[PDB]
Design a binder for this molecule. Sequence first.
Ligand SMILES: O=C(C1CC1)N1CCN(c2ccc(F)cc2)CC1
Length: 130
Amino acid sequence: SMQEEDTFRELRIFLRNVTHRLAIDKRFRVFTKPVDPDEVPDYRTVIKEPMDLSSVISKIDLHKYLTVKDYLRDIDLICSNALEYNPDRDPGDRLIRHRACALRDTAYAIIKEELDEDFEQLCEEIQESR
Ligand SMILES: O=C(C1CC1)N1CCN(c2ccc(F)cc2)CC1
């Protein structure tokens, strides 16, 4: 229906706004663009599904997310990729992991305060119905 297409448009507006707030935070700069294969040729052989905040913006616009749960699977994949690729005790690795965990916890906290649970339940029921 028209009403269902209006529900999914509101979902996209909400997701662009959360993603822009993460992307301007100086802590999360390393997560804003894909890894350059020239700089890190080993990256694409270790990490099977790369993900970053520029790709998440592109996926919102392509209508890839029908629920906030779909969207948070990609935020969780940005975080898990960083913990897998950078697992060592040295400071460079410990700083990337700390920032990855902060990206994940910040996205979950914005959504806890600002997403209405009945708006998410509506998105999930339209998705199920298709
Ligand atoms: O996991 C990531 C970020 C996507 C989250 N990276 C770890 C490895 N970094 C790197 C850069 C130059 C270099 F010569 C070797 C490694 C780039 C940043």
